[PDB]
Each structure stands twice: as C-alpha cells, then as structure tokens.
Amino acid sequence: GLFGAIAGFIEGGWQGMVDGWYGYHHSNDQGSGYAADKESTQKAFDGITNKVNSVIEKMNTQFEAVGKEFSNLERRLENLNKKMEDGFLDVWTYNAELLVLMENERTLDFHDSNVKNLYDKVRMQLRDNVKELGNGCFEFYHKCDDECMNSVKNGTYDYPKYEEESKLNRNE
Amino acid sequence: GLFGAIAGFIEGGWQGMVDGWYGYHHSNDQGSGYAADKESTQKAFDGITNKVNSVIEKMNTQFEAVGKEFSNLERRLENLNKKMEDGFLDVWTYNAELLVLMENERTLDFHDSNVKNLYDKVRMQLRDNVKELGNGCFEFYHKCDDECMNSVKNGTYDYPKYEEESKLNRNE
Amino acid sequence: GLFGAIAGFIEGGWQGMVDGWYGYHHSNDQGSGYAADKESTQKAFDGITNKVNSVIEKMNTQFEAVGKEFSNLERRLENLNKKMEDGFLDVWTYNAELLVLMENERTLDFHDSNVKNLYDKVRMQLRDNVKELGNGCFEFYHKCDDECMNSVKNGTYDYPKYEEESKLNRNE
Amino acid sequence: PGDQICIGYHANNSTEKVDTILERNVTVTHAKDILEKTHNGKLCKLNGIPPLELGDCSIAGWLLGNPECDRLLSVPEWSYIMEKENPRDGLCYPGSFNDYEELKHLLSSVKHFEKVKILPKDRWTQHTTTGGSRACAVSGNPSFFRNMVWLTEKGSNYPVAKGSYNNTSGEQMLIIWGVHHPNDETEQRTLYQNVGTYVSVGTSTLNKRSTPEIATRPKVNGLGSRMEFSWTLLDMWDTINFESTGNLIAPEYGFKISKRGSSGIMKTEGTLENCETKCQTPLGAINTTLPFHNVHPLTIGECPKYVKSEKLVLATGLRNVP
C-alpha cells in the first residue's frame, strides 16, 4: 500500500490482537503478548466514522422519480421525462459508486499511514537503544521488563535512562 | 495526518515564522531565530494556486435555471421543468461540496508531505554529524555557526568537511 | 511529489533502464549496469491497468442525446429539452475531466510511493552494512560481487553473513 | 538474542470484500454495506393509512361511477392509489377523457375527496334523467355512470338545459361533464329531438364548448357512439354554468378536495395485504435504516435514495492480511 507498512514491511496481521486496529506485541524474560494502541485506534475510528457520515450525507441531495402518465400523442414529452429520470438515476448511481470506490482506496491507505506513523513514533523514541529488524520489531540492547514495555506503549520510555546500559551492550 | 509531521512528530507550529509555510529554527553560540524555506514554500504555493483554479474552472460548466411559466393545464410539464432544474441544482451543489471536501483533505496532507520531505532532505544531508532528537530537531556533533546553519538551509552543508570533527565528538 | 522520491531525493530517471518502471543500478569490481525490479513493476502495472478500466467503466452509464423536433408553438418544451440534454452533457464532461485529473494526480503519487517503498525495502535489508548516500544509492562496507548484488535485488542479502566483515570496514 | 516490541495490526476471519479504483475484491477486517436490496413483496398500509385499491376500475371508472365500481362510491382518506395497468372497468359507455393524464397528476397531491351532490338529478324537471345504456348494464338492464346524468327528451321536447353551482364547499372542487357523440341521426332525434345542438360550460376562467359529432364508428362495448368527458377544478366561491340544447352528460356530483399531500398512483396488479410500512414500492415494502436501496425507482413515503447499483460496500477496517 501507499505507506508500505500493511502487507509491506510488516508482512501480516495479528489474529491475537482482538481489541484494536493497531498495536503491540512484546517479548521479554517475563513473557509475551498482544496489546492494542488505544490512542491511534480511537483517532482512526473517529475519522472513519466521520468518513461514512460524509459519504452518506452528501448523497442525501439526490433525485427522486415521480410517477406521471402521458397520452399516445405525447410521446416526445414521455421520452423527455424518461430520459430525464433515467439521466439523473445514472448520475447518482455514478456519484455513489465512484465515491465508495475512491473513499475505499483512501480508507485502506489511511490505515496503512496510521500503522507507519505509530511505528515511526516508537522508532524515534527508542533511537539506538534498539536494533530495527526490518519486520516491524525492535530488539532491545538491554533487558526491558513489563514496566519498561509499558513505558514504550504510552510514550514514556526513558532513553536518557537506558542510554549507557545499551551502548555497552551494543559495542561489547 | 497522512505523513506524520504536522501535529505529529513536529508537535506544533511556529508563530515566530511569519514569512513562509515551512522552514527552520536554529540555535547556536551566536544566537537563535526563525527562517522560512523559500523553495518549498514557493512550490507549495504554486500547487495550491493551481488547485483552487482547477476546482473553480471545472465547475464553470454548470447548469443555469431559466424562468418559464406554465398554464393550469400544464402541471405535468411544470413539474418536469421543476424536477429538472432542481435535479441539476442538486447535482451541482453535490459536485461543489464534494470537490471542496475531498480537495481540502488533500491540501492538508500536501502540506504535511511538504514538511516531511523537507525534514528528510535535511536529515539525509546531515547524516551522522547530528543526532535526530525525534521532535523535528537535529543536534550537531560539532559547533555550527551562522554560515554553517546557512549551508544546511540551502543544501550546501559540507559533511565530508565536518566528518572527522563529529565522529570524535560522537565517540569521546 | 507526495512521497519525496521521484524528482526528489532520487533526483532523476534512468534512460538506461528500459525494461521496467522501477529498479536497480549496481557498481562493483566486476562492472556496472541497470536491471528493472520485476515484482514492483508488475504490481504497479496491475494497479494501473485496474485504474484505467475503472475510470472508463464508471462512465459507461452516461447520458445520450436523442434527436426530437418541436413546433414554433412549443418553444418552452424545446428549450426544456435543450437545457436537459446540454445539462447532462455538462455533468458528464465534468465527471470525465475531474476523474481524469484526480486520478492522474494519484497515478503520479502511486509511482512515487512505489519507488520510495522499494528503496525502503532495500534499506531495511542492508542495514548498517552500507552507507545511505542520500541520492538513492547505498555504498557497501564490503566488496559485493554479482551474486551479492543479485541477492539484494530479490531480497536474499545475507546481513548475518556480512555482519562482521562490514563492522571492521566501518570502524577501521 | 534480546527483547522485542513489535508494531502490528489487527487481522480476523472476515471475508468481507470491497473494491477500490486501484484494486478489486479486497478482503477487509470490517466493512459497512450501505445498500438495501430487500423488500417484503407486499403492498401495505403507509403509516397506518391504507391505499385506495381501485381493483378492476380505472381512475375514470371510479370518478364517473361506472356501475362495476360501486364499492368506490364513498372512500376514506388514502396514502396512495393502486391502479392496474389495463383496468377493465373504465368508460363502460365508450369514448374519451380530455386531459386525463393531467387529472391523474392532480391526484398525486390529493389524499381525500368529499363527494358533494352539486346538481341533484331531481331538479332537471324539464328533461328525462333515467337514460342509460346496455353498455353500462346492471342486472340485465340498461344503466349508467352513477355520478353523471344523461339528459334526454321529455314529452317529445328538449328545452335549453341550464344548471349552475356556486362552490361554497370550502375547497377547490373537481367537476366532470361530457358530450354525447351519436352514431346516427335517428339516435340524435330519438334522444334529443333537436339538431345542431351544443354543450356550453363556463366558470370565471373556463369557457369550453362543444357540438356533438354524429358519425358511424367501429363498435366498442357494442356502440359506434361515444361520450367525450372533460373536467375542471372549480375554485372556492366560483360558479360553474352548464347550458345545452342536447347531448349534455351532466355531473350530479363534484369532488371537493378534502385532504392534500404527497401521494401517488402506483401501477400494480396486486392487492393490499395486512401489513404496515413507512416506504412502499410497486414490488413491495421497504423496512431499513440504510441510506440507499436498489429495489425500484418509484417509491412512496419516507424512503432511502434509489440507485441502480448491485452493491455499495464501504471499507471501514483495514486490509485483512493472513
């Protein structure tokens, strides 16, 4: 996709992450598991809810066919009426189908962007205290406990804190 | 936003940068201050000016209602006329409102992309002579004077030049 | 462009790469040359072929003018017919022109994204066994033969393999 | 070999598919179908108000009072009118109905009439009013449209027939009248005694006259003769004047428009069932909260917007990746 994360460098999804659209899987001495990122999930949910309302609401100003009858001596008028009602019908079908297609494209790319941005947020926080594996994971140059994993997931990782511990690991 | 810079890793805007959409703030021994990046600002200005003209110009081929009257024995014809004029009115209102919404979305994301690309341009130039702080700033592994800051802002930073000075700083 | 690669950090195109949209140029002791990346080229080709079909197919539900005549005492009816046929004509011209403009915008950005994602894929694979020059090229911290270049181009570069050879080069 | 945090995204067992401009048939974790494609196959009450079911009768058969339509002699307020494509019971006495389609269009905005006896038959003291035809027979004897009066010779004379009605009813009133076009001169003489007759009708705004046309025509319902009907809407406090020396088919009643609003005539061969809806189509009733439907373009009531689409599915979740 446009942002290269979904079915990209992060090759697949997680059946095991049931509580959100985007999030984490951690692995340490204490164990492993999944956790949704609530902030980014909610922000995307809000946008998507806005999108669907927008697409619907903009096509509430839509043409309606009204039943009229014409004599056998009013065939041109009858044809004009039919061409008009059909014409608007075609225009509105076009508007609906196109809008759904274009916006579906954008919805998939929005989710891709949200995953990439979350990844980048964590990356830019961990810096060189981790190795970027290239698969969506960061491998720590230090032991990172549950409280340590919890700090990353809510953006309170103390890099100035683990700075010296990791450089020794990274170099030795 | 889609590119993760505006209200993203660069958390806020600068009231103090009054002469352009995107640019720099530098800080050294000689002092500090703001400067717009003229090249990227102008390129975005040109695109945005093109966008507005496009949206207007494509809706100059728009329906106009013409005043006609009908007898009390021409009610179907009157209704056909009314359904037609209203129908086109609804179509054009839809086209205008949708175009503005979709293009507003793209305009905000365009600016986000322009900020991200400018950031990346500077990043890819400074390389490891700086630390990426994660907030839009780069902290130099050397003293960088006004002439030095001026080289970065117009893409003439000499990395091959500061290469040795910074590695000693970076390691010591 | 939106993704910053085409006419961006990769400043120009390659006349010498005639067999695909995106790809490689390598340089080593054995020589140099161009090669298209077949996978990413094919994926973009498939999308673009889908795009053109979509734009055409959605505008197959288009209004057709039917030839009718009116008396000198049916001028309002004649005008209604003319306003209708012209009105739909304007709507469909608008739909066609707008769709082509919006989708042309997206096509150029799609190609930009595809180049950026290919670059990032190679980057995330080579890691610190190479220097990122900032121009689309990676310079190896080791000799990389034809078989070595071939591994990168199809994502089978052995980093765990060249890991030690490069760090000595990178540090010495 | 060290610790890891990975960034990732949800996947599930959804098989929901969507299309984009760039790709078709994409599986997504969540999606929203916005197109109603179902209906209950029935004609229903609309907000508890039943339609007027004409059965085998046409609009003309109802309003003129074709004897086959006697169940419709007094009908309550309706929400829409059900008419067959080719109703059997219309003009039992063959002929034509001027501006008929205009009359049907009027009915799209009328939800009730009060039939008012504007020109009681017994006040035609100088003419015979018992006139009927085998083409409108009832129980084997000649009869006639229940709402109309066929004036004929009385005592071998047909004096100038004049009737007038001031619309004091409190609403606009629909009034129909006709002119009889005989097959031959003997028919004209036996019925009216007079020749070179006329029918004149006048309101403040309408002035419409007629001379009957005698001519041999193909038989319809057994008759080469015809009756040609016309109509007008009589404004509040306006008067209608009828004047004739022969061939007038007078209204006995007018239809006061007693309720107005959005209605319509639905073309259908079907019958009303004991069901309730907010949205009726000729194919059946719709019950949905979805914004679009593809059931039929001709709907009555509070309906979704109609499109020709076979599918409208919006992606809401992301690409569902194994």
Place this chain on the structure above:
Amino acid sequence: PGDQICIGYHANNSTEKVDTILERNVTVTHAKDILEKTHNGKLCKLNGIPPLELGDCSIAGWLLGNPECDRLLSVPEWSYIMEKENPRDGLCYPGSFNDYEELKHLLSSVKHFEKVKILPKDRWTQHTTTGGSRACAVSGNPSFFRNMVWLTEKGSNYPVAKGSYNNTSGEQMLIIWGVHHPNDETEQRTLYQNVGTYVSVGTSTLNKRSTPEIATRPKVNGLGSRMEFSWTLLDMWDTINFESTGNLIAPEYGFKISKRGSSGIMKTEGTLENCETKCQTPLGAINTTLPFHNVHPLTIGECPKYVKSEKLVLATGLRNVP
C-alpha cells in the same frame, strides 16, 4: 548539549475553519471562501440599461393596451421585465389569452419592440370602431384596450370585415387579435346584427378560425361575456389577413421585434431603484468576483454559478497548530 536546526511550519492566529471527508471544523492558517452570500436588496439597471417595470400591469395588459397601463404605450429598450405575481391590470374585459406562456417565453429573448400602426382604425369605413366597455372605463366612461379595435354594427349593418397587412417592417412582428364571446343573443344582435358569425385569420403558415360562443357565464369585472385573444409572429414579407362577419377584435398595432438578446421576466413585487449591476436576482443585485453564490437560482446578467450551499471554503494554508 549541542547546536540545533529544527524543521517546522507556520502557525498564526487564524480562526478560519474548513471541512474534509475525514474531519470537520479544522482550523487552517489560510483559507479561501469561494461562495458569495450577499446582495444589495435592490432591483437595478443592468449594465446601465433599466428594466421594463410593468407595475400593476401584466404582459397582456401592456400589449393589448389596458387603459390602466397607458404609461407603457411606448417604452424604450429594456434589460429584463419586472412583473408582479398577480398583476391587477390585465384583461380589463374578461377572457383568455391563447398560448400566453409561449408569448412570455418569447419575451425572454426580446429587448425592444417598435409598435407599428399596421391597421389604422380610420380605414374601417364600413364599421363602427368607437366600441368600449365599462369594464375598461376611463374617467367614468366606457373605453377599451388602446391597441385593439372593437368593430361593431354601423347603420344597422355589419358587412364582411377584411383587413390585411404585409410585414414590410424589416423584422418579425408580434400581432394579437381576439374574438368576442357574448353573454346572450340580444348582445350579439345589438353589437353585430349578424348571427352564426366567424373570425378568420391567415398567414402563409397560420390558418386559425373561430365562431363566437354565446353563453351565460359568471360575472367577472361585471361581465358574463368574454374576449379570447390569440397571437402570431408574422414573418418578414409575409401577409396577415383578417376576415369576419362579427365578433372580431382587431389589432390596430403590431409589435416589431426591434432588439433581440438574453433577457427575462423577473417575478417581483418591488420597484426599480437608482443603482447599477452586472448581475440581478429577484432578491437583489450581486457584486462579486467569487465563482459561486447562493442568493437565488433565477438570475439575469453576468453572474456567478448558483449552488444551494451554506458554505464553500477551500483550505489553502495548513492545519493551524498551537
């Protein structure tokens, strides 16, 4: 602790808001409102050319020459025509105007007439022409439409009335004529002496005739009688022939189409003010360079495109971030 260059973006004190598909009510640093919502509330000259202000007169009242419309007997070129919804001064002598809406539609493309005395009244030497009615009275005495001639009996006789006019005027010419439909036989005899009369009109393309209809009708402006007007456009170098044995209301004048172009009839109760515009609506004049407006759909002149929108604001700057 070292030196820094930061990349950033502009912010300001703008409160300008825009909408997107994904988000509503977004504050941006710069925006462009492309919708005109204001007008001056006045009816104005259009490019320095004033409209034709009918006042209490209808199109028919003007062209026939209802005596209450005498200020309109000669009018200069106009840019649009102002007509009230229900003008008081139309057919002073009650009746009807055939194809009236077609005539008004013609006027949308006409900007001036030259009224030409095609059939001077004094040339009707075998008929009385001073005929008038209390329904069109002037200063307490019977009068008549200024542009028309009511032919009546002269010396107790009404010979065949024939008038003809060859359109040598250099443009197409609008010509109106009428037929008088009396209330009764005594009126017919007193006015025309003849019975079974007719009015025939013929050009190279038009052949339209009439027999007057005598009938009692509701009184309008005091009369049960009616005058029924018709019109034609006489082509350059074509001739119109009038022939009648009674009941003809002849034109004295024709209206030569002396200027053509886009105009229109604006329905308004208001009056012309001393102002100038390039774009007039029934609500008031628009002065803008904006591409859209939401003022009224029925505009005349060089106008922006109308939409129903309450707002159209394009973001030009970026998201305004504190």
Place this chain on the structure above:
Amino acid sequence: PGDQICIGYHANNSTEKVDTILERNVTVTHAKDILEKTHNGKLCKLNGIPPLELGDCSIAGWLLGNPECDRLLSVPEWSYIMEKENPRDGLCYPGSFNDYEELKHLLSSVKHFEKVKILPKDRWTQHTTTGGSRACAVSGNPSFFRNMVWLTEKGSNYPVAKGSYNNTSGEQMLIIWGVHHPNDETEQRTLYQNVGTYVSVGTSTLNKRSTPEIATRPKVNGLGSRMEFSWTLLDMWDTINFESTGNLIAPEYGFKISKRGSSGIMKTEGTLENCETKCQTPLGAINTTLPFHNVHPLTIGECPKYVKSEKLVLATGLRNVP
C-alpha cells in the same frame, strides 16, 4: 570508495503530457489518450444497412407522395433517415400537418414500412378522383400527392363519401388524411357543390372531425387555399371509418410498420457515400475502440460516449524526469 546499488526509476524520450489538480502540463513516461476526435467526414451504411436518403423531400413529402418524391414510392428497410434542414419538396399543395413532430418521433423507432393499398381509388364510384393542382404539377399538367385521393363532384353531385378499412395487415398501420380549406365560395361550389360540409374520422379510440374553412389567405405555391393533414396509428384488427360531404382528402394507402428498432432522423445536407460504419454522426462516421469521443452529440449506432472535452489523457507511467 566502495560498491553501490542504487534504486531508481525509468525515464524515456516521451513528450506525452497530462494534467493533475495540483499541476498542469506534466511529462509522463506513458499515457493513454481515451478521447476519439476523428471521423471520416462521410455518411455511410450502418452495419451494411443504408439510410433512407430523402434528398430534397421532407418526411411529409415522402409519406403523402409529393410527385417530386416519386423515387421514394417504395423503399427498403433503413438504418437512419437523412433529412435536409429545409427540404424543398413537402406540401406541394400548401397547408399544415397536425402533430408532425410526433410523427417524426415515431419514425425514430421504425426501420421499415410496407405501403398497403387500403382504400383503392377505383372504389370511389360516386365521386371524381382525378382531382389535382398546378401546385403539384407533373410535366406541365395538374397532379397530386401520389398516396392521397382528392374527392370532388361527379355529375354535379357529391354524395356522402364513406370509406372504411379493417387493419388485417398484422402490424400497426400509419394512416394520413386531410381536409381542404378553400380560398373562396366559388372554389367550394365548383369542387364539392355542397356547403357546410364536414370530414369525420373514427377508430375505436380516435374521433376527430373537421369543417373546412373558406377564407382568403396569402398565396403559397400560388394558392390561398390550404390542405390540413392529420394522422393516426391504426391498431391491429381495428377499423378506421371516413365520412364526408365534401373537402376530404382521403388516403389510398396506409403504411404498415414492418420493422421496428432504434433509428433516427439525421439532419444533414449531405449524401450517402459507399462506406460502412458501426457509428454514424451528422458530421461523419466514427471508427474507434476509445470509450469517449467529442465529434457530435447526435449519433446513431454502437458509439463511444460523447463529451465536450478537447482532451482526455490518462497518465499510466510516471513523471518523466531528465
């Protein structure tokens, strides 16, 4: 100084340009033009079926049988009809054609007629049928519309003329008839002997009558008289009855609708050439696989969709960068 792999993109010598919303005149490596702008400038056969080329004849001239249109007396199936803007050969005897535009509209869905001799001229044994006019002359002598019969006095008498035809042809049939409106009373007497004449026509659904109008009118093709034509579609197994005491212009033939389908009347001054197309426009034939064209809105056959655009070019490749 070490080894390198670079990522890059294609460039070529393409000069193909496209537009976007953000930018205009962008050079791309590959593009797809989706707009046909060319045609062959000729009128052609449509799928091997030639059009009906009226030449100088109008639809009316053809169907009535104006003698200048004799090449059209029997014509094979057509794919479209070519008619000039102002055909010279129409009503040679001047007059009018009621509901003419409706008749032309019918022809949009008719691809062939079989002309059937429904009322053979020789069966009018009580009337003269050789009547003609110098306005329809052939070789210097008076003649008449080939498909019509002008009934006149025989032996100084004009008995009631009655003709009838039951449509047993197996399809709906177009039938035209007329009424002659003389210039004067002497013409009426010389031709018909009778006064106060009428023409009556009746089917199961149509009842249309006429009284001829005698009146002096401007000369057209030398005549102040007129013939007024009307038409009907006679249903299968229905009968049409003509009855007249004078002034009837009877059909001798009916036009059985022998093939139906999408056709049309193309307005063109041009002539058929020896060429073949699937898509015909008034400007010339289109041969393309492109989805859009900008040639003309009025096309017949299997055509691309028409738009007003000067260009429609889709980018397929990327920005072409030096």
